Design a protein around this ligand. Sequence first.
Ligand SMILES: CCCCCCCC/C=C/CCCCCCCC(=O)OC[C@H](O)CO
Ligand SMILES: CCCCCCCC/C=C\CCCCCCCC(=O)OC[C@H](O)CO
Ligand SMILES: *C/C=C(C)/C=C/C=C(C)/C=C/C1=C(C)CCCC1(C)C
Ligand SMILES: *C/C=C(C)/C=C/C=C(C)/C=C/C1=C(C)CCCC1(C)C
Ligand SMILES: CCCCCCCC/C=C/CCCCCCCC(=O)O
Ligand SMILES: CCCCCCCCCCCCCCCCCCCC
Ligand SMILES: CCCCCCCCCCCCCCCCCCCC
Ligand SMILES: CCCCCCCCCCCCCCCCCCCC
Ligand SMILES: CCCCCCCCCCCCCCCCCCCC
Lengths: 254, 254
Amino acid sequence: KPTVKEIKSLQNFNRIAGVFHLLQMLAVLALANDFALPMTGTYLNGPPGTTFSAPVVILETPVGLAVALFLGLSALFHFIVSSGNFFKRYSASLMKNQNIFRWVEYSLSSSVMIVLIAQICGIADIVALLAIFGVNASMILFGWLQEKYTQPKDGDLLPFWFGCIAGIVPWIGLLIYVIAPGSTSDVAVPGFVYGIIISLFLFFNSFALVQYLQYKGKGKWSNYLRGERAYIVLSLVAKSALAWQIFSGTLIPA
Amino acid sequence: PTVKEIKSLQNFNRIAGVFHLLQMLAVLALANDFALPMTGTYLNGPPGTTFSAPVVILETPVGLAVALFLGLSALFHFIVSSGNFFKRYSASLMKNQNIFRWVEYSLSSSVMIVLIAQICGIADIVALLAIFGVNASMILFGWLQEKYTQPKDGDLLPFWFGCIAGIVPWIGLLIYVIAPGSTSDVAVPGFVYGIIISLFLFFNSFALVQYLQYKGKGKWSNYLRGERAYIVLSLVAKSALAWQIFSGTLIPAL
Ligand SMILES: CCCCCCCC/C=C/CCCCCCCC(=O)OC[C@H](O)CO
Ligand SMILES: CCCCCCCC/C=C\CCCCCCCC(=O)OC[C@H](O)CO
Ligand SMILES: *C/C=C(C)/C=C/C=C(C)/C=C/C1=C(C)CCCC1(C)C
Ligand SMILES: *C/C=C(C)/C=C/C=C(C)/C=C/C1=C(C)CCCC1(C)C
Ligand SMILES: CCCCCCCC/C=C/CCCCCCCC(=O)O
Ligand SMILES: CCCCCCCCCCCCCCCCCCCC
Ligand SMILES: CCCCCCCCCCCCCCCCCCCC
Ligand SMILES: CCCCCCCCCCCCCCCCCCCC
Ligand SMILES: CCCCCCCCCCCCCCCCCCCC
């Protein structure tokens, strides 16, 4: 049973994560250049099975603003959950092995992040980016249903496994683009792009491992609160790591 | 529900199987070798600079892909109609569940929406992969609605998640038919509009069946009515798409 001291400590950690992300959000908004990545349409120039027009730019992702957005969403929800006003709802949810505000935040913030990673890899088709956003959101919503309908140690991981099936799809997409089957150019994928894909792939797998460990509920993971803390650590570090790598790689003259 | 009522649904599954198997044969025998490309449009400079011309990675053999969604339907309709599955089928129906329906739909409806996307000129391989994944996710949410909720309990959360995932490919189609930023106003063929509009209505009809079942008002309080509606919709939707694709693209000798 989660005590009042334990919940209050978790609220404090949420607040700390919020301040880190809010300050990083300010730093990116202030310091970032106007680097932009295109969303494109490559339209038929006749009936299906004929030829295509050249890709056209439909809109440009303002990368600095998009990084600020996933940091800002994190700050907002970490601050909401940390509030004394929310202690009762937070306590009640943790008692039921749930944190719904976590999934609401992740469904938006992690989806912004994987779209930015896709664009940094050169994925530009607007339907590719929309469907990556949608399938990544679906991964999060499956994790939400795992918490809503199961309890740790009840032997039921079906929603979790559905989440893994949805969750892996964007990463298969990235792997296809970095392999670049049929490519004519001899240009290498930049080192900093490999850094982003590999480090954030590891972070995304870490989130899945937290839910798996929580719902297996073996050893120290029998205590749901250990997973709650792990999620805060992973969201703090994953978001800060992606923001810094995008900033360092694309948003400064250096 | 009466044993007779279930034997009846067994019979209806068999009838649907025979129609789809015969249509599968007809398409395999009669269809031309019409193919739709899956493309990669790779960076040929650092992120935020230049792209190579799109390259064709592979070609969807449209006749074989139509035969595949008809064949998947025939296979699962035959599996569930078997006297050897009558216990497992009856048992699941008794619990307001049909897992074999969702397993089939997760593959067959995903092949269908990818084909519709390609007919609309969506070609980027990540667009088509992520459309497959988000459409499969829509089906898996429908499965979780049946697994975890009871009709009339007021809980449609998995259903609404399925709607969020489910609408994403259709927003994609709408973007490609509007073709924002296009250099010219290239006409979408009438038969393509027929396919998008008819199958959008069919896809909405599937969602309405689950909604009606879990609201559980009127005759829809009887789960077997929805089981029957799903068989009718999968029979008609698949036959309608197969005929429209065949008539639109698979007739002329190439
Ligand atoms: C419940 C009953 C289920 C019944 C199943 C529903 C079938 C839907 C068929 C729609 C065909 C719509 C018309 C498609 C052909 C349009 C031809 C056209 O208008 O051509 C324009 C041309 O491209 C420029 O000149
Ligand atoms: C709540 C959000 C709902 C939004 C998601 C709904 C998606 C509808 C998709 C297909 C329906 C059929 C589409 C037929 C309408 C096509 C529009 C059109 O005809 O435009 C041509 C264009 O201007 C070039 O000339
Ligand atoms: C800023 C927050 C981030 C990056 C959160 C990421 C979360 C995930 C990658 C979650 C993954 C999960 C699965 C792959 C399976 C189901 C359980 C989840 C939702 C934890
Ligand atoms: C051949 C079989 C087909 C075309 C099946 C299609 C099924 C759907 C479009 C299902 C849609 C659903 C939702 C949009 C929400 C959740 C419930 C579903 C799975 C019935
Ligand atoms: C049996 C379940 C009911 C599902 C509804 C689907 C059937 C109704 C179909 C309507 C198709 C309308 C298509 C009109 C397209 C013409 C436009 C054009 O040619 O430009
Ligand atoms: C990158 C986003 C999608 C990730 C999907 C894959 C996540 C897998 C991580 C959790 C699964 C762990 C399975 C463990 C099986 C081995 C035996 C466990 C020992 C207790
Ligand atoms: C709990 C029931 C026991 C059955 C578990 C087996 C089901 C596995 C489902 C596979 C779907 C996962 C897809 C993603 C895997 C990719 C791994 C790469 C990540 C490093
Ligand atoms: C010229 C190529 C020869 C024929 C290949 C046709 C097969 C296409 C399959 C490629 C799949 C790419 C991603 C989109 C669909 C995803 C479906 C797979 C999930 C199980
Ligand atoms: C195209 C695939 C995705 C479809 C998503 C949308 C499906 C919506 C259809 C079912 C929902 C109906 C909601 C009814 C609104 C209120 C009506 C009151 C009567 C109970």
